[PDB]
Symmetry: C2
């Protein structure tokens, strides 16, 4: 069975299953999946470019731009010029956005702890380290 041990299929299924669990919680708290991904990805961050945000939220950049249009209208994020090279727009979370997602972020930490608890701290840290190294090797 080709797919049983094919890495991209394993990553895709694990990602879908784990994310879908928490996305149900996010929607019960009034967030769409894309709104949660953006706010979670900007929380605690310096301003980042739209392109960086699209990568970390695994969302196409034109979709991110339309999303930021309405989230900025709601005062949850702010777009800013890149002071130097100004073909680049930066984006940050506002205080209003952070307060809006703070409780959901604690629920997200609790869900993650539950997902990882059966594996133990060693295997959990290994997994996160390998995933981080893979991302940094393949990000364009």
């Amino acid at each position: 069975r080709f797919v049983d041990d094919y890495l991209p299929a394993l990553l895709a299924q694990a990602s879908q299953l784990i994310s879908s669990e928490f996305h149900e919680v996010a929607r019960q708290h009034g967030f769409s999946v894309s709104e949660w991904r953006v706010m979670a990805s900007l929380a605690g961050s310096e301003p980042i470019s739209i392109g960086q945000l699209a990568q970390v939220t695994v969302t196409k950049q034109p979709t991110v731009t339309r999303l930021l249009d309405r989230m900025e209208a709601r005062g949850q994020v702010e777009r800013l010029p890149h002071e130097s090279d100004r073909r680049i727009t930066l984006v940050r979370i506002t205080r209003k956005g952070l307060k809006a997602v703070e409780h959901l972020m604690e629920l997200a930490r609790e869900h993650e702890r539950r997902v990882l608890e059966p594996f133990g701290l060693r295997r959990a840290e290994e997994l996160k380290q390998t995933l981080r190294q893979m991302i940094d090797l393949h990000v364009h």
Copy 2:
């Protein structure tokens, strides 16, 4: 930075980056992403239910059904009744479909080998084992 070590974000980015690399190869060989996921997931498999196929291909079931309508028209797959409980439709790859995807599957194995080579056999097997265990714990 909340998202830097948040497992669902790490899985989602690693999955997107790794899959997107190979999906470019698939399209150069005339396959859409969904066609490749279905054929790869059925290769070497006994017939599986539509619901099982939707899970392993991380594709919504109504989307899978429409996809199978056209792939069955092209003779690449076949739907079959579940002989017992027959609220269930099963699906399999045909010989024509297998021959169509055989070369792409070898390219997929080579791409996977390249992705995993920097990590070594131990860390690669750990990763696949952890992902498999996570899937089996969270699949509904």
